Enzyme design. Sequence first.
Site, PDB file in Angstrom:
ATOM      1  N   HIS A  72      11.631  11.067  14.672  1.00  0.00           N
ATOM      2  CA  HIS A  72      10.636  10.568  15.637  1.00  0.00           C
ATOM      3  C   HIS A  72      11.295   9.492  16.490  1.00  0.00           C
ATOM      4  O   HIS A  72      11.945   8.588  15.976  1.00  0.00           O
ATOM      5  CB  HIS A  72       9.373  10.014  14.938  1.00  0.00           C
ATOM      6  CG  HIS A  72       8.508  11.068  14.293  1.00  0.00           C
ATOM      7  ND1 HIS A  72       7.465  11.688  14.941  1.00  0.00           N
ATOM      8  CD2 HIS A  72       8.542  11.609  13.048  1.00  0.00           C
ATOM      9  CE1 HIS A  72       6.893  12.558  14.129  1.00  0.00           C
ATOM     10  NE2 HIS A  72       7.528  12.531  12.973  1.00  0.00           N
ATOM     11  N   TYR A 201      -0.815   4.153  15.077  1.00  0.00           N
ATOM     12  CA  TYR A 201      -1.328   3.004  14.348  1.00  0.00           C
ATOM     13  C   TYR A 201      -2.531   2.587  15.165  1.00  0.00           C
ATOM     14  O   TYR A 201      -2.426   2.489  16.380  1.00  0.00           O
ATOM     15  CB  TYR A 201      -0.278   1.883  14.365  1.00  0.00           C
ATOM     16  CG  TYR A 201       0.856   2.078  13.383  1.00  0.00           C
ATOM     17  CD1 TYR A 201       1.929   2.902  13.673  1.00  0.00           C
ATOM     18  CD2 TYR A 201       0.834   1.456  12.141  1.00  0.00           C
ATOM     19  CE1 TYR A 201       2.957   3.103  12.730  1.00  0.00           C
ATOM     20  CE2 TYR A 201       1.846   1.651  11.207  1.00  0.00           C
ATOM     21  CZ  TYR A 201       2.894   2.470  11.504  1.00  0.00           C
ATOM     22  OH  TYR A 201       3.865   2.682  10.556  1.00  0.00           O
ATOM     23  N   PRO A 293       2.338  -1.691   3.289  1.00  0.00           N
ATOM     24  CA  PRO A 293       2.727  -0.453   3.982  1.00  0.00           C
ATOM     25  C   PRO A 293       2.776  -0.446   5.518  1.00  0.00           C
ATOM     26  O   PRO A 293       3.400   0.445   6.112  1.00  0.00           O
ATOM     27  CB  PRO A 293       1.678   0.535   3.494  1.00  0.00           C
ATOM     28  CG  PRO A 293       1.330   0.025   2.131  1.00  0.00           C
ATOM     29  CD  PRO A 293       1.238  -1.441   2.339  1.00  0.00           C
ATOM     30  N   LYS A 297       8.398  -0.420   5.176  1.00  0.00           N
ATOM     31  CA  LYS A 297       9.683  -0.957   4.725  1.00  0.00           C
ATOM     32  C   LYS A 297      10.001  -0.832   3.236  1.00  0.00           C
ATOM     33  O   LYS A 297      11.160  -0.893   2.838  1.00  0.00           O
ATOM     34  CB  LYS A 297       9.794  -2.431   5.150  1.00  0.00           C
ATOM     35  CG  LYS A 297       9.718  -2.645   6.660  1.00  0.00           C
ATOM     36  CD  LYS A 297      10.894  -1.951   7.316  1.00  0.00           C
ATOM     37  CE  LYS A 297      10.805  -1.950   8.813  1.00  0.00           C
ATOM     38  NZ  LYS A 297      11.393  -0.672   9.328  1.00  0.00           N
ATOM     39  N   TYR A 385      11.319  -1.948  13.567  1.00  0.00           N
ATOM     40  CA  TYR A 385      10.765  -0.711  13.056  1.00  0.00           C
ATOM     41  C   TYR A 385      11.853   0.254  12.629  1.00  0.00           C
ATOM     42  O   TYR A 385      11.777   0.787  11.526  1.00  0.00           O
ATOM     43  CB  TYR A 385       9.795  -0.075  14.051  1.00  0.00           C
ATOM     44  CG  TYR A 385       8.849   0.910  13.412  1.00  0.00           C
ATOM     45  CD1 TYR A 385       9.224   2.243  13.211  1.00  0.00           C
ATOM     46  CD2 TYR A 385       7.584   0.509  12.976  1.00  0.00           C
ATOM     47  CE1 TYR A 385       8.370   3.154  12.587  1.00  0.00           C
ATOM     48  CE2 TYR A 385       6.728   1.413  12.350  1.00  0.00           C
ATOM     49  CZ  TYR A 385       7.133   2.730  12.161  1.00  0.00           C
ATOM     50  OH  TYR A 385       6.306   3.621  11.533  1.00  0.00           O
TER      51      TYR A 385
HETATM   52  C1  LIG Z   1       0.519   3.895   0.720  1.00  0.00           C
HETATM   53  C2  LIG Z   1       1.984   3.682   0.564  1.00  0.00           C
HETATM   54  C3  LIG Z   1       2.737   3.949   1.632  1.00  0.00           C
HETATM   55  C4  LIG Z   1       4.050   3.600   1.677  1.00  0.00           C
HETATM   56  N1  LIG Z   1       4.561   3.944   2.811  1.00  0.00           N
HETATM   57  C5  LIG Z   1       5.854   3.564   2.894  1.00  0.00           C
HETATM   58  C6  LIG Z   1       6.645   4.077   4.058  1.00  0.00           C
HETATM   59  O1  LIG Z   1       6.333   5.019   4.852  1.00  0.00           O
HETATM   60  N2  LIG Z   1       8.012   3.610   4.082  1.00  0.00           N
HETATM   61  C7  LIG Z   1       8.617   2.775   3.134  1.00  0.00           C
HETATM   62  O2  LIG Z   1       9.806   2.435   3.172  1.00  0.00           O
HETATM   63  N3  LIG Z   1       7.835   2.368   2.081  1.00  0.00           N
HETATM   64  C8  LIG Z   1       6.527   2.768   1.979  1.00  0.00           C
HETATM   65  N4  LIG Z   1       5.923   2.643   0.705  1.00  0.00           N
HETATM   66  C9  LIG Z   1       6.611   1.985  -0.444  1.00  0.00           C
HETATM   67  C10 LIG Z   1       7.497   2.835  -1.417  1.00  0.00           C
HETATM   68  O3  LIG Z   1       6.716   3.962  -1.923  1.00  0.00           O
HETATM   69  C11 LIG Z   1       8.005   1.989  -2.608  1.00  0.00           C
HETATM   70  O4  LIG Z   1       8.601   0.780  -2.156  1.00  0.00           O
HETATM   71  C12 LIG Z   1       8.937   2.802  -3.504  1.00  0.00           C
HETATM   72  O5  LIG Z   1       8.147   3.811  -4.167  1.00  0.00           O
HETATM   73  C13 LIG Z   1       9.656   1.970  -4.558  1.00  0.00           C
HETATM   74  O6  LIG Z   1      10.717   2.591  -5.186  1.00  0.00           O
HETATM   75  P1  LIG Z   1      11.117   2.183  -6.603  1.00  0.00           P
HETATM   76  O7  LIG Z   1      11.963   3.203  -7.137  1.00  0.00           O
HETATM   77  O8  LIG Z   1      11.678   0.840  -6.411  1.00  0.00           O
HETATM   78  O9  LIG Z   1       9.891   2.089  -7.586  1.00  0.00           O
HETATM   79  P2  LIG Z   1       8.790   3.177  -7.976  1.00  0.00           P
HETATM   80  O10 LIG Z   1       8.584   4.124  -6.907  1.00  0.00           O
HETATM   81  O11 LIG Z   1       7.560   2.512  -8.486  1.00  0.00           O
HETATM   82  O12 LIG Z   1       9.352   3.885  -9.206  1.00  0.00           O
HETATM   83  C14 LIG Z   1       9.701   3.066 -10.308  1.00  0.00           C
HETATM   84  C15 LIG Z   1       9.844   3.942 -11.535  1.00  0.00           C
HETATM   85  O13 LIG Z   1      10.162   3.251 -12.767  1.00  0.00           O
HETATM   86  C16 LIG Z   1       9.286   3.682 -13.801  1.00  0.00           C
HETATM   87  N5  LIG Z   1       8.992   2.724 -14.862  1.00  0.00           N
HETATM   88  C17 LIG Z   1       8.078   1.711 -14.751  1.00  0.00           C
HETATM   89  N6  LIG Z   1       8.037   0.909 -15.825  1.00  0.00           N
HETATM   90  C18 LIG Z   1       8.982   1.431 -16.701  1.00  0.00           C
HETATM   91  C19 LIG Z   1       9.360   1.013 -17.956  1.00  0.00           C
HETATM   92  N7  LIG Z   1       8.780  -0.144 -18.354  1.00  0.00           N
HETATM   93  N8  LIG Z   1      10.353   1.743 -18.648  1.00  0.00           N
HETATM   94  C20 LIG Z   1      10.904   2.801 -18.063  1.00  0.00           C
HETATM   95  N9  LIG Z   1      10.586   3.263 -16.832  1.00  0.00           N
HETATM   96  C21 LIG Z   1       9.604   2.546 -16.169  1.00  0.00           C
HETATM   97  C22 LIG Z   1       8.043   4.084 -13.107  1.00  0.00           C
HETATM   98  O14 LIG Z   1       7.404   5.061 -13.922  1.00  0.00           O
HETATM   99  C23 LIG Z   1       8.563   4.704 -11.801  1.00  0.00           C
HETATM  100  O15 LIG Z   1       8.931   6.011 -12.095  1.00  0.00           O
HETATM  101  C24 LIG Z   1       4.616   2.953   0.592  1.00  0.00           C
HETATM  102  C25 LIG Z   1       3.873   2.666  -0.581  1.00  0.00           C
HETATM  103  C26 LIG Z   1       2.557   3.041  -0.592  1.00  0.00           C
HETATM  104  C27 LIG Z   1       1.719   2.883  -1.809  1.00  0.00           C
END
Ligand SMILES: Cc1cc2nc3c(=O)[nH]c(=O)nc-3n(C[C@H](O)[C@H](O)[C@H](O)COP(=O)(O)OP(=O)(O)OC[C@H]3O[C@@H](n4cnc5c(N)ncnc54)[C@H](O)[C@@H]3O)c2cc1C
EC number: 1.14.13.2
Lengths: 394, 394
Positions: A72, A201, A293, A297, A385
């Site tokens: 995009h 948005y 969100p 980021k 962005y």
């Molecule tokens: C509505 C929404 C929209 C978003 N839109 C955007 C967007 O368009 N762009 C963007 O950059 N970000 C956006 N995000 C954010 C993005 O989804 C998160 O920042 C990202 O999922 C984080 O990645 P992560 O791997 O750090 O953690 P997570 O995705 O939470 O995964 C962490 C993992 O560790 C596991 N775990 C937890 N505790 C334990 C434990 N104690 N022992 C073993 N395993 C464990 C969990 O089960 C999970 O599988 C959005 C979030 C939401 C909710």
Amino acid sequence: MKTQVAIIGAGPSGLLLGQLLHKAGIDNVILERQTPDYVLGRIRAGVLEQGMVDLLREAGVDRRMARDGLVHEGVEIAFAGQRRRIDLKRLSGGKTVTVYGQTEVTRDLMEAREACGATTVYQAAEVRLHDLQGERPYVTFERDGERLRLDCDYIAGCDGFHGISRQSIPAERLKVFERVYPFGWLGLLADTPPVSHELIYANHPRGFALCSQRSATRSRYYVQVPLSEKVEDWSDERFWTELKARLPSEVAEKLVTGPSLEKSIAPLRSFVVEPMQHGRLFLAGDAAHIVPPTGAKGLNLAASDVSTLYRLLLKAYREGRGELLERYSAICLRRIWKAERFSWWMTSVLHRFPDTDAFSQRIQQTELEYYLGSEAGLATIAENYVGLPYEEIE
Amino acid sequence: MKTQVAIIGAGPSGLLLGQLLHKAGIDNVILERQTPDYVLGRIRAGVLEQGMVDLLREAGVDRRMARDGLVHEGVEIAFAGQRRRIDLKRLSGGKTVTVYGQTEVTRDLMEAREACGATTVYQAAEVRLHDLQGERPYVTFERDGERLRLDCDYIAGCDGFHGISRQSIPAERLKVFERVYPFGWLGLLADTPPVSHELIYANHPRGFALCSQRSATRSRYYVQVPLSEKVEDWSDERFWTELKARLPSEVAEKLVTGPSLEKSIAPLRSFVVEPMQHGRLFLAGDAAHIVPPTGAKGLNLAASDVSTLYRLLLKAYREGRGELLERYSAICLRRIWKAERFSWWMTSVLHRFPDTDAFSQRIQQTELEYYLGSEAGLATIAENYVGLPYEEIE
Ligand SMILES: Cc1cc2nc3c(=O)[nH]c(=O)nc-3n(C[C@H](O)[C@H](O)[C@H](O)COP(=O)(O)OP(=O)(O)OC[C@H]3O[C@@H](n4cnc5c(N)ncnc54)[C@H](O)[C@@H]3O)c2cc1C
Ligand SMILES: Cc1cc2nc3c(=O)[nH]c(=O)nc-3n(C[C@H](O)[C@H](O)[C@H](O)COP(=O)(O)OP(=O)(O)OC[C@H]3O[C@@H](n4cnc5c(N)ncnc54)[C@H](O)[C@@H]3O)c2cc1C
């Protein structure tokens, strides 16, 4: 049982780091509390930065993304009944964003990891971290019954906001920064075509609305809702009525509604912990910070955290340079705070806040009018962005 | 006693409008509650925009200013012990600001008005406005005893925040927007040379500080102080100690202190009334709005208000186009709100606020780091600082 880098969490973070590490020959084991199936059920992110797209390429997991992703060059902002487009590409000097669901990204890394045969323990119960400040830390967990031990040299906490790694660093050694917003996001995924080829948005008197997508036949829409709401209180029909009501008419008009594939409420929060590491434990992604969100980021910061952690684990391992890892926190926070500030700004200019006096209302509208009407204002939105540049290191 | 445009207030606004009107042959009479001497005692503004400087030229009152004024191509912002300069000229595409005290500007217009022999009644007591919606309004006042009447076609309310003109419009017809800041500015004028050839705005943990000037041998410094302070509580010595304490060391070091010529406390406020006119009454400058001094927009907005009012009074008089005056409010508010938003932003990033949590502190610092480190961020500061362009009209 031994490994070089124990990784807690099989989300985009742990998988991406695990993948990058594997390519360089640095052994790692990932521990996930849930099932491959649960992790795949999370919808979340749809927007990816340039740096993330290239990082996905370096980890050799960008085939499907290069095929199905959508590049995009602009995004739109509607307020006071007037769409204003931000030419990301033009204003950022060539950068763009790629819409590709996080579910897909996670699915691609899961496949790449299974093919290469690297270790991955799902349903790892009771993960506990020990000897964090020693020369030889270790993780304990229960695989369906028996308590197993895993020795490693380093631990990358990629377990998210409710993970165990941040809880394992002595509370007194951390400084937390947090803001909780008085509203949340009601999201709906539908198997209908998106209303616009670009994200819209929307700031409306009734509240925020966002028109996004996953592909040409799948849409993701969001509307701002107060904290009191329970998802079971929103029939698909109410959501469509509400979405249509917050959008500009020429948009509500061509909107193709349909049954929801998923509906969930995500409350907005801003959170940063300083530092992001303790001894041989390094936090990454949502384990270390949360952004609302609005700016898209979250997943994108996770990538730079990982990108930074990986490059430092290489120096330390391949080049026998372990003192460099003390820089991780310093390096990451700079990008984290800029990303946080941007996300915060987006949220404040696009949503409707409760106890808002006339002057603040007027200031909010003028912020939009100004940044959206000025060539320099548009450029500040765009460069933030598409995502600010990653830092070199050293 | 008759005139074409009755003008309430002999401040920079009324004098400037009166002057511009006189050049076009549009008779006007100015009414001032105070003495020429009192009006000249106010120190106030030191920074003038480009548009104001040219407006002063069009009114043929720019001789002394072109001589003694100081053109500044940059301004500085210090925070976290680091000065960062904003190249106004470079970033704005050639514009600059001129430091020339408001006392001087007021003194020049007073002389220009006396030479040309236009009417000016000082110590006009009990000014009262009548028949505002009629075809023939009038002003009444008491010149040292006797009640005099002055008939006119239009009234320009240039009497400031505590003037009578805004009080004369039915309260129910106005919408007020206001924000009161929990701090004020302690200002000190000294007959010493300035510490820097350019203005230095300073964000410090102890509070805001600003190093400004009037000439090469006269300085104006400001420090942020809470509302509880009484000016009599600040000896010159306390002020210098405090100023030195809020500045970067390499600056506090070369600071030449000396006895105060003037010390006053100015509380910060943001105020806008909508609309800015009622019948044959038109508000201008501080009568219609107030901006906190942080952005240096006050006197500068007065100029554009006047510039707009003048150009419309011409159309109406010379071109017999009286329906165009209904646009004044619309035209002015656009620039007013952008100027207000800028002033508000400056104030929020430079001052220390009382009940501020860790996240807000961090966000404030990152705002500075970002806008001050980005080429697009610097440009938004600069174009707003030199002043946005005036609107054409019609
Ligand atoms: C509505 C929404 C929209 C978003 N839109 C955007 C967007 O368009 N762009 C963007 O950059 N970000 C956006 N995000 C954010 C993005 O989804 C998160 O920042 C990202 O999922 C984080 O990645 P992560 O791997 O750090 O953690 P997570 O995705 O939470 O995964 C962490 C993992 O560790 C596991 N775990 C937890 N505790 C334990 C434990 N104690 N022992 C073993 N395993 C464990 C969990 O089960 C999970 O599988 C959005 C979030 C939401 C909710
Ligand atoms: C600390 C400080 C710093 C500032 N710094 C800047 C800066 O650098 N740049 C900038 O642009 N702005 C700045 N300003 C703002 C600027 O000084 C004002 O916006 C400007 O003085 C307003 O002009 P004015 O003519 O509208 O009103 P005023 O200056 O208030 O004059 C109005 C006049 O009308 C008279 N009057 C009042 N009531 C009546 C009555 N009822 N009948 C008859 N006559 C009456 C008053 O006596 C006064 O003479 C600063 C202000 C302060 C306090």
